[PDB]
Amino acid sequence: DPMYEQFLQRIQAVRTATVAKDISADILEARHDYFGRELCRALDIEYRNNVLLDEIILDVYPGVNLMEYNVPHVTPDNYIWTGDMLLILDYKVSVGHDSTEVTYKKYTTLILPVMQEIGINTEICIIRANPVTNQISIVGEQFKRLFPTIPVELNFARFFELRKMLLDKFADDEEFLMMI
Numbered sequence: 379d380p381m382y383e384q385f386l387q388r389i390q391a392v393r394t395a396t397v398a399k400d401i402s403a404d405i406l407e408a409r410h411d412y413f414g415r416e417l418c419r420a421l422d423i424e425y426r427n428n429v430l431l432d433e434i435i436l437d438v439y440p441g442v443n444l445m446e447y448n449v450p451h452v453t454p455d456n457y458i459w460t461g462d463m464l465l466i467l468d469y470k471v472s473v474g475h476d477s478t479e480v481t482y483k484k485y486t487t488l489i490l491p492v493m494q495e496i497g498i499n500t501e502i503c504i505i506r507a508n509p510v511t512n513q514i515s516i517v518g519e520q521f522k523r524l525f526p527t528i529p530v531e532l533n534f535a536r537f538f539e540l541r542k543m544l545l546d547k548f549a550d551d552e553e554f555l556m557m558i
Contacts, residue, residue, distance in 0.1 A: 381408055382536050382540070385401065385404070385405055385408070385540045386540065386543075388401050389401060389540060389543050389544055389547065392544075392547075394553075395548050395551040395552075395553035395554030395557065396553060396554075396557065398544055398547070398548050398551075398554050399554060399557035401544055402541060402544055405537055405540050405541050405544075406471075406537075406541075408537065409471050409509065409534060409537040410469055410470075410471050411427060412534075412537070413469050413471050413507050413532065414427060414455060414456070414469040416530045416531075416532060417469060417505060417528065417530060418456070420528060420529055420530045421525055421528065423456070423458060424456075425456070426455070426456045426457075427455060427456070428453040428454070428455060429453060429454065429455075429456070429457065430451065430452075430453055431449055431450060431451065431452045431453070431454070431489060431492075432444065432449050432451075434454070434457050434464070434466075435449065435493075435496065435498070437459070438459045438464055438498060439496070439498060442496060447492050447495055447496055448492065449492055450488040450489070450492065452484075452485065452488050452489060454466045454467060454468050454485065454489070455467055455468045455469050456468075456469070458521075458524075460524070462499065463499040463500065463501060463520060464493065464498055464499065464500040464501070465500075465501050465503045465518065465520060465521050465524075466485060466489060466500060466501070466502050466503060467503050467504075467505065467521075468481050468485070468502075468503070468504045468505070469504075469505055469506075470504055470505065470506035470507070471506070471507050471508075471509050471534070472506060472508070472509070473508055473509065473510060477506075478504045478506050478517060481504060482502055482504055482517060485502045486502055489502065490502065501518050501519070501520045501521065502517075502518065503516070503517065503518030503520075503521040504516075504517045504518065505521070505528075507530075507532055507534075509532075509534040509537070509538075510534075512530075512532040512533075512534075514528050514530070516528075
């Protein structure tokens with residue numbers, strides 16, 4: 379309820395289409411964060427949210443001569459270091475594939491080349507929950523191996539209820555429905 383009650387209070391207060399756009403964005407990010415926490419709790423994985431690639435590299439290889447490499451400033455949601463391979467983790471909560479595809483191709487281009495230079499075996503993994511049906515889909519062959527079953531009990535209804543009050547409130551608003 380704490381996170382829930384804060385959004386409710388903002389919705390209760392909000393008068394304008396523009397500020398409502400911010401509430402909607404914050405709710406979608408809170409829903410992302412909720413899935414991430416549950417995923418990591420149901421896999422005994424340490425929950426992190428956004429960790430710079432430099433800090434990943436130094437964590438898995440403290441002795442790297444980091445100043446030699448040009449490390450892109452990307453902040454994947456999480457990672458798993460199996461002592462053999464680095465699985466970069468990104469959480470998605472979407473009904474469709476497209477957000478996954480954008481982040482998959484972005485991380486392929488920006489992460490994997492410097493991880494190959496440094497010589498660290500890495501795989502881009504993206505885990506996505508459908509927020510209507512609760513079904514999980516996984517991109518990343520090796521991730522599917524270590525975790526062939528993910529037993530989470532997801533419940534996104536509260537997020538839907540908050541965003542529904544908002545959309546019902548500003549249902550006749552060009553400035554809001556535009557900032558979709």
